[PDB]
Amino acid sequence: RGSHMEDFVRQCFNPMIVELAEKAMKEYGEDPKIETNKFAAICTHLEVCFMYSDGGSKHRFEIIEGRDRIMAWTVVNSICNTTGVEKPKFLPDLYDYKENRFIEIGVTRREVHIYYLEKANKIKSEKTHIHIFSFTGEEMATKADYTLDEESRARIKTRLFTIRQEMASRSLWDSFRQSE
Numbered sequence: 001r002g003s004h005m006e007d008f009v010r011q012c013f014n015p016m017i018v019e020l021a022e023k024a025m026k027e028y029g030e031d032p033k034i035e036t037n038k039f040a041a042i043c044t045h046l047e048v049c050f051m052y053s054d055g056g057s058k059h060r061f062e063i064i065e066g067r068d069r070i071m072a073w074t075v076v077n078s079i080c081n082t083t084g085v086e087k088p089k090f091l092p093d094l095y096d097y098k099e100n101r102f103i104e105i106g107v108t109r110r111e112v113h114i115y116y117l118e119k120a121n122k123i124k125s126e127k128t129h130i131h132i133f134s135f136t137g138e139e140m141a142t143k144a145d146y147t148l149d150e151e152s153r154a155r156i157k158t159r160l161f162t163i164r165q166e167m168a169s170r171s172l173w174d175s176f177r178q179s180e
């Protein structure tokens, strides 16, 4: 109770995003008021996913991240049962209607190389595209296919470095970087 991080998080992110992160955490046992670095990470992840879907066309993406567990899986099965793609082992973040694949978004506080390797080994189902973002500005996509145009990805990187800065200016950055 009474952490600087928790007050910064609800100040940095959109209320609807904070609410979705809150609900997503409690659904999986975590508590936003003690596990505040996770709380911070979940909002960043959520916002990155939303900006990602904001790239490209209006019908381009179907957002899986943000929905509750059961409806998310329901949309996945509908997407698999209509497009023929194989159902993924873990819940993905997006489905690309133009490129006919699921997308797994990553936000990491280490060199993009390791995190990609870990998530590429977490699913091992292939097909499911992986797109990794770092807080420094590095990105990382399967087959070097970065899906969106450069300007849409540059927006995401810019926002990620703004979050890093606001955290450091309040001295929460170092603890946040170590929590992963």
Ligand SMILES: COc1cc(CCNC(=O)c2nc(Cc3ccccc3C(F)(F)F)[nH]c(=O)c2O)ccc1O
Pocket (backbone or CB within 6 Å): 024, 025, 028, 030, 041, 042, 045, 065, 091, 092, 093, 105, 106, 107
């Ligand atoms: C409560 O926490 C969250 C739960 C959800 C619903 C399903 N979880 C993901 O979809 C997801 N989880 C993570 C990190 C994480 C966090 C908790 C458990 C497991 C994992 C993972 F094993 F995946 F590493 N990183 C993503 O990129 C990612 O898409 C979404 C965002 C969250 O913040």
Ligand SMILES: [Mn+2]
Pocket (backbone or CB within 6 Å): 065, 091, 092, 093
């Ligand atoms: Mn996800």
Ligand SMILES: [Mn+2]
Pocket (backbone or CB within 6 Å): 045, 093, 104, 105, 106
């Ligand atoms: Mn993800």
